[PDB]
Paper text:
Analysis of the crystal structure of the LBDs of [name] Tlp1 and [name] revealed that they have a double Cache (dCache; calcium channels and chemotaxis receptors) fold. dCache domains consist of two tandem subdomains (termed membrane-distal and membrane-proximal) that likely emerged through tandem segmental DNA duplication.
The three water-soluble compounds with the lowest predicted free energy of binding (4-methyl-L-isoleucine, β-methyl-L-norleucine, and 3-methyl-L-isoleucine) were selected for the subsequent experiments. Among the non-natural amino acids, α-amino-N-valeric acid showed a slightly lower affinity for [name] LBD (168 μM) than isoleucine and leucine, followed by β-methyl-L-norleucine (Kd = 294 μM), 4-methyl-L-isoleucine (Kd = 324 μM), and 3-methyl-L-isoleucine (Kd = 484 μM). Comparison of the crystal structure of [name] LBD/L-isoleucine complex with the final refined structures of [name] LBD in complex with L-leucine, L-valine, α-amino-N-valeric acid, 4-methyl-L-isoleucine, 3-methyl-L-isoleucine, L-alanine, L-phenylalanine, and β-methyl-L-norleucine shows that the binding modes of all the new ligands are very similar to that of isoleucine. The aliphatic side chain of 4-methyl-L-isoleucine forms van der Waals contacts with the side chains of Tyr118, Trp151, and Val171 and is positioned within 4.5 Å of the side chains of Asn116, Val126, Leu128, and Leu144.
Residue numbers in the entry: 38 to 132, 137 to 285
Write the structure that this text describes.
């Protein structure tokens, strides 16, 4: 009851929950950066091949194919591939790499968007065309001496990130770009019929990392969210710690 005591409990729990939110933020960050570093290394190894090894399709198969395969295995990626301007893609898939002409690669965001930036492009999660798993794709237009070779893609199962987030301490969770729930420590929050408005509205009012109160079934809860890339990361807890 004494306001000194309530303030002490509030300040403690704000610190604790902030810390835990930041661990889930770090988890998302480190997943991305590891995948980006991998993709960058692969780009470098492909671009360091002589032009002769890159300028016929049979040479791409025989010289780039093994690189795609070893890299895929190193990280247990689902697919690793190189898309060419003739519409063919050299594909190393979890199951030697094949040059596929039937995958409509120029319709794909991972292909188109890699040509519009000099960075790595990271897709939202989507259902892979070939293996029918949900993946996050990292793509990169590879140039040698300023000349485009093709677009590299690396597909990592989105489950990998979901699992990493779920293992974190705290009642933390992630929304995707469209404010749909994406990952959670408590698997029940993944019910698509849960309304997240209260938290999402309190986030909009308060901003990144700003602790707020809200109600659930007439009881008080405390939480915070923050943007992490296109995701929104949140933590919530009961306010019993400060009230009882
Ligand atoms: C090669 C390319 C078609 C991949 C299978 C990519 N994950 C996609 O679904 O667009
Ligand atoms: Na890294
Ligand atoms: Na690796
Ligand atoms: Na957690």
């Amino acid at each position: 009851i004494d306001p000194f005591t309530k303030t002490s409990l509030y300040e403690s729990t704000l610190k604790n929950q902030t810390d835990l939110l930041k661990v889930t933020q770090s988890t998302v960050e480190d997943f991305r950066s590891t995948n980006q570093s991998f993709t960058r290394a692969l780009e470098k190894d492909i671009a360091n091949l002589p032009y002769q090894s890159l300028i016929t399709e049979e040479n791409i198969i025989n010289n780039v194919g093994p690189i795609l395969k070893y890299y895929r295995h190193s990280i247990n990626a689902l697919n690793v591939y190189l898309g060419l301007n003739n519409g063919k893609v050299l594909l190393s898939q979890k199951s030697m790499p094949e040059l596929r002409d039937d995958l409509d690669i120029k319709t794909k965001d991972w292909y188109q968007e890699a040509l519009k930036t000099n960075d790595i492009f990271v897709t939202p999660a989507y259902l892979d065309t070939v293996l029918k798993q949900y993946v996050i794709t990292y793509s990169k237009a590879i140039y040698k001496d300023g000349k485009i070779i093709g677009v590299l893609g690396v597909d990592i199962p989105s489950e990998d990130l979901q699992n990493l987030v779920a293992k974190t301490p705290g009642n933390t969770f992630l929304f995707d770009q469209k404010n749909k729930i994406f990952a959670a420590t408590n698997k029940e929050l993944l019910n698509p019929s849960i309304d997240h408005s209260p938290v999402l509205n309190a986030y909009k009012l308060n901003g990144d990392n700003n602790f707020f109160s809200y109600k659930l079934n007439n009881e008080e809860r405390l939480g915070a969210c923050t943007k992490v890339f296109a995701y929104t990361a949140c933590i919530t807890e009961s306010a019993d710690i400060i009230n009882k």
